[PDB]
Design an enzyme around this catalytic site. Sequence first.
Site, mmCIF file in Angstrom:
data_model
loop_
_atom_site.group_PDB
_atom_site.id
_atom_site.type_symbol
_atom_site.label_atom_id
_atom_site.label_comp_id
_atom_site.label_asym_id
_atom_site.label_seq_id
_atom_site.Cartn_x
_atom_site.Cartn_y
_atom_site.Cartn_z
ATOM 1 N N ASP A 5 -3.957 1.764 -8.494
ATOM 2 C CA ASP A 5 -2.752 2.500 -7.827
ATOM 3 C C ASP A 5 -3.026 4.052 -8.028
ATOM 4 O O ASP A 5 -3.099 4.535 -9.340
ATOM 5 C CB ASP A 5 -1.491 2.216 -8.438
ATOM 6 C CG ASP A 5 -0.198 2.805 -8.014
ATOM 7 O OD1 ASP A 5 -0.461 3.996 -7.209
ATOM 8 O OD2 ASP A 5 0.745 2.677 -8.595
ATOM 9 N N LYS A 66 -3.862 14.586 -4.941
ATOM 10 C CA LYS A 66 -3.552 13.553 -3.948
ATOM 11 C C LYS A 66 -2.884 14.402 -2.790
ATOM 12 O O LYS A 66 -2.945 13.828 -1.573
ATOM 13 C CB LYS A 66 -2.598 12.691 -4.447
ATOM 14 C CG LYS A 66 -2.460 11.484 -3.499
ATOM 15 C CD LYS A 66 -1.765 10.264 -4.036
ATOM 16 C CE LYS A 66 -1.284 9.160 -3.258
ATOM 17 N NZ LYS A 66 -0.701 8.142 -3.871
ATOM 18 N N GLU A 170 -0.151 1.296 -0.130
ATOM 19 C CA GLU A 170 1.091 1.185 -1.179
ATOM 20 C C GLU A 170 2.288 0.254 -0.824
ATOM 21 O O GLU A 170 2.340 -0.792 -1.745
ATOM 22 C CB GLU A 170 1.357 2.365 -1.533
ATOM 23 C CG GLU A 170 0.286 3.422 -2.531
ATOM 24 C CD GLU A 170 0.560 4.683 -2.627
ATOM 25 O OE1 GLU A 170 1.813 4.930 -2.614
ATOM 26 O OE2 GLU A 170 -0.209 5.679 -2.820
ATOM 27 N N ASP A 194 10.400 3.178 -2.416
ATOM 28 C CA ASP A 194 9.480 3.719 -3.427
ATOM 29 C C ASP A 194 10.027 5.116 -3.771
ATOM 30 O O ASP A 194 9.581 6.270 -3.309
ATOM 31 C CB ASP A 194 7.923 3.845 -2.720
ATOM 32 C CG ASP A 194 6.949 4.280 -4.069
ATOM 33 O OD1 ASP A 194 7.382 4.878 -4.881
ATOM 34 O OD2 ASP A 194 5.767 3.893 -3.752
#
Lengths: 376, 377, 84, 81
Positions: A5, A66, A170, A194
């Site tokens: 992850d 990211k 994800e 999330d």
Amino acid sequence: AVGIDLGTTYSCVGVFQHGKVEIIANDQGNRTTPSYVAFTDTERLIGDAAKNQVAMNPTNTVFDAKRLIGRRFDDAVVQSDMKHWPFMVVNDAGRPKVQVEYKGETKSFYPEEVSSMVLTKMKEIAEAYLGKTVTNAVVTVPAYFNDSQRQATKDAGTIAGLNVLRIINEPTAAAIAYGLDKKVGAERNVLIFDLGGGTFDVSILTIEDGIFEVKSTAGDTHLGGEDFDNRMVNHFIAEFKRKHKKDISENKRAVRRLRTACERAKRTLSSSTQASIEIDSLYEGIDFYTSITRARFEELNADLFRGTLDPVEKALRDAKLDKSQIHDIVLVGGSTRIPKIQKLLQDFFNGKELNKSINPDEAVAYGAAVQAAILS
Amino acid sequence: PAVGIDLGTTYSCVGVFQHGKVEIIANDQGNRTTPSYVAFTDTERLIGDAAKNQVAMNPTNTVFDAKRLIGRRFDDAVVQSDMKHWPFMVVNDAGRPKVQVEYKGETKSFYPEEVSSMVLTKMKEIAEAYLGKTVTNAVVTVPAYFNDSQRQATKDAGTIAGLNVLRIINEPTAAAIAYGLDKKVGAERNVLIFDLGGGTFDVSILTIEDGIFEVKSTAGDTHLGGEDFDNRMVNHFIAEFKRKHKKDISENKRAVRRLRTACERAKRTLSSSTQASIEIDSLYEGIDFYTSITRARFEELNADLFRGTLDPVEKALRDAKLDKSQIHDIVLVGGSTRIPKIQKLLQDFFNGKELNKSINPDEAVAYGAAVQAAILS
Amino acid sequence: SEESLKHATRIIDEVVSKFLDDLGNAKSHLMSLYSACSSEVPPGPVDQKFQSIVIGCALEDQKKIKRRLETLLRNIDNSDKAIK
Amino acid sequence: ESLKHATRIIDEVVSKFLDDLGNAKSHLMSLYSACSSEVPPGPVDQKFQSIVIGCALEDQKKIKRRLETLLRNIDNSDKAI
Ligand code: NA
Ligand code: NA
Ligand code: NA
Ligand code: NA
């Protein structure tokens, strides 16, 4: 075959074995590793060591890679983000690169090179645990990533010497972790909620006979646990002014120690209705002592907590679904531990039970590990 | 990559020939030679430098000179004589001598070749640490006078150490190969190898024709070497200390050990300088030892021993049916050949002939063995 | 003789500098912990996990811990001075 | 819990250091014994002994004294931690 992850603030790596998933801890025993990379006069640091020297070497410590991976320099998101980062971002033929000081040498790196470094550390963590060399892996990315961002993430894996079996979403990984793809019935829907340290994503998936399809995504890329911490910090800075007539806001060290105290208090408020904060000589030799209740914590974050429901409503609309049409709700991200967040979502869905038995910081990695075992 | 091992009586040396150059390998302490010592303690078995470092605290369980027992009967006169200078125990197991020691609280006895096998193991490990690869092939040297059983026992010792002994070669032949004497042009060449180490003296005459070696004669004194020259100095200074301070240090082992070390150092210095100072902080009863010695005085103390090295030379020549003028090359091996007076006596004996000595005398044998090992594998 | 003194000094020096380096690593480790307790600007790294654990202690324990670190760093510094 | 945890992280740095003190001491003892007129109680670095026996008289005394002082400082540092 491991599942990774690759998070914006922290990363996690798991491996399927003995019919179960195992989330691998690093050298320091931490099951998650900061997505940080530091360049000093002598060495390059990754993970905890990188984060521990942030204060002395702020301009050469990189994070949030990211947020750049797969984007163009002229991207409206890049331009906006680089105004908040302490490190430099330069233009290189339309491609963004981070510029830092490494061994007295001014160097620059591509977003995917920084990520490959994080992946390398994760690869090394898994190797230390299994004993063998690890090469095969499944890596995850946000469901909203485009082909450019996905490819750049795969390349990051490739550079790290990994054989990326697949790039999966994800939210899909979270649903796989809960086996929401293995059961009876017909085409069902799933909402993944999330909320991590700095990102908030809501995704609606539809699973039909073991096949996944993203129906919609929404959220706030700049909303996370750190914001709830900031609200507390500002609260205590103002509290300190009132009790001691002193303003610490311009004292880096004081603010940081307070922030650390607020993070613990927040954790405590997840299982207790009250928490106490104590800090030796916070400012000018003055001891800081105080307390805070869950109710007050919730009031301080009221607009942020209830605001998480707007992306839920937006995702529902974009999926063309009524909330009563959601079959499963999954909680991922450390911040989903906050009772008020759980209550707001549950009440919104009229008491529907929430899937949360799997450590919210490890669910994504957990699911990717499962998928890796299947593709190995 | 095959290595060459000089399995010596007092010290051993390992070298390897790669990329057209011989490399004498240093051990963990950076020493190019390793003591052929093996010690046994309450917790471990030490070999080499570490074994020699603790001899004073553990004298009866520290073995050395095992090579002097190879191929010997317990009742041979030389074994009974040698046993008197050894702190460790030697017993008779059915006619064969075995060194006996205490190890981890237990009484253990070892055949002389087993002790050698332990030394070969240490040398094997030293080589591997340097090469970073597994060392399996090797050439091991033995004295030219060794018989079949002695050679076989050394080979077996190598096999047990995990080495594939490509060949057992004579020490003097190895020295001749180090100097490339077998690669020269012409008819038969007669070579004399003069080998004077710390405790032994060997003279060998070899004939070389078209790269083929033949031992013509061997002579020497199994109990003559550098240690005897140091001994003459030790006794000389013990008498001088007695004369000057009216104190006899002879019964204080530590004092004698430090004086011996001082004399060894002085001897080495006299191979490069014409005089040496000999000083020892609080040698006996806090009394400092302070004196000096000239090279000439050192030669005088050893005169009979130095001149005596020529008798074996004459015997080897006589046995090889050669006149001294028929020797084409002279090779010096062994640390004690560094002594100027010894070299001069040898050079004069051969009418001023130049001696082969550019190669470190302590390493020449390992050097030649390394070269032959590369050729053999 | 003068060379012997030099070679002797080197051998002891290598043993000492080795120890001094082991004493330097201990100092850096303790320094990352101390800085986690200090209100001063950190000269180097700051152990974040340790900073959390400390802040989670009672006020007087935070003071204790910091006091223990200042003592060790002092004793470690006295050691470095005497042993050169 | 926290106090115990903070203390445990500090005790490990100390323990490691005490181990290094021990290593320095054993190494220094082998060098010091090479200088002593006593029968060696432990290992004697033979190479060092050869070298020191080679130094001038007063340099032999200096070396021995330096070694004695180092061993004393190592012990003082040991007991003080
Ligand atoms: Na991106
Ligand atoms: Na990129
Ligand atoms: Na690990
Ligand atoms: Na403190």
